[PDB]
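pipeline/complex-builder :: batch 7 item 3
reading input block
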Amino acid sequence: EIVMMQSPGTLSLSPGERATLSCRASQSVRSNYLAWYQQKPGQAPRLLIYGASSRATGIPDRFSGSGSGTDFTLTISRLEPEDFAVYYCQQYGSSPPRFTFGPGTKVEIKRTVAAPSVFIFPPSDEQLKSGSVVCLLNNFYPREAKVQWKVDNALQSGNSQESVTEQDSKDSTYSLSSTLTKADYEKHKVYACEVTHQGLSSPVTKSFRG
Amino acid sequence: EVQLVQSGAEVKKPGASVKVSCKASGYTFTSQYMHWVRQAPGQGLEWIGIINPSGVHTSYAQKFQGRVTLTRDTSTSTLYMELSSLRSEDTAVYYCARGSPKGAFDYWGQGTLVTVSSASTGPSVFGTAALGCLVKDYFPEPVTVSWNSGALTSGVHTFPAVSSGLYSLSSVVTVPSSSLGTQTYICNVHKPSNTKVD
Amino acid sequence: DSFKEELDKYFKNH
């Protein structure tokens, strides 16, 4: 078969900058039948470029492909927050029918620092009947954030599960959701989560039984 | 607008067979070759095979030879993908794509997730303001989350799922303080367990 | 010829 390679593995750039994606094929691609596909989170792939350099219908001029033989390039000028996706290259041939994809290149969009909005959610009485405090960090950049739980000024370790959304397709902000997963809960009172982030000039803590 | 519409997600035991469908009405589809591409979670795209307009000719990838069967119904404009002897590595989102007369796949279906798990398939739910719905203990993926029947789509954050072996995700939303007492919204939660809690 | 036509010529012998 025709093995497809791509580089780099991950690319992180700012809006308005130019992204350069490479695609290498193990054999020469007959008729320059090279395609580039954009796949955003939770969506199906979307055809950007076919025939090495042909924009599909609806694709803006800032998307551009080039190359021949074994080396091909996709250039995304004037990057936009909506361009956050994984980009695959694909060769296709007719005689015999052959369709192989590249491993993909994750393109991340950088932005300016943005501070999170912390929200404390104590567990409702519904979950207490079965025998998990949820801390929310809403719309922030960058992704790296230190979330620490302190039950009555006691740093918890090994009892919290975090979850981060994908980078937003409009403002490139992340959202995090911690879960401080009834026996050990009725012994303490003041539960809190402290968030540390470079958008906060000082550490912020959200506390709250009753 | 012409559009590919695939069937819902199915959960199949190992060794069982699965049959996924793809509705491809309109001359744009009925006059072209159709393809099937799958994508294992966190992996790239893998081409499965191709079927001709009349449905008589097929060509399968070397990996899937002998295990897949592509069929096409021209009187209903419906495509089918059958894969037998499902193993764990077959768990993937199976896409149906239209082969452009020029070659590339320019039309794609939304995808169909096939979960090959031996474990049994029922989730439980529990300036400005913010509200959320905690959905824990569920298997297998996924568990869709909507707010006010999709009427509120500006500000929603449905986190991905995450010890006991059961999935758990949360869906949050942001609303002003004045809209709390005026608008009453409910979150709409799992096709494998055929559960639809609000 | 178009890619679809090249495929049609492929399945003529296969």
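note: The interface with chain B takes residues 2-4, 7-8, 11, 14 of chain C (CB under 8 Å).
queue -> next item
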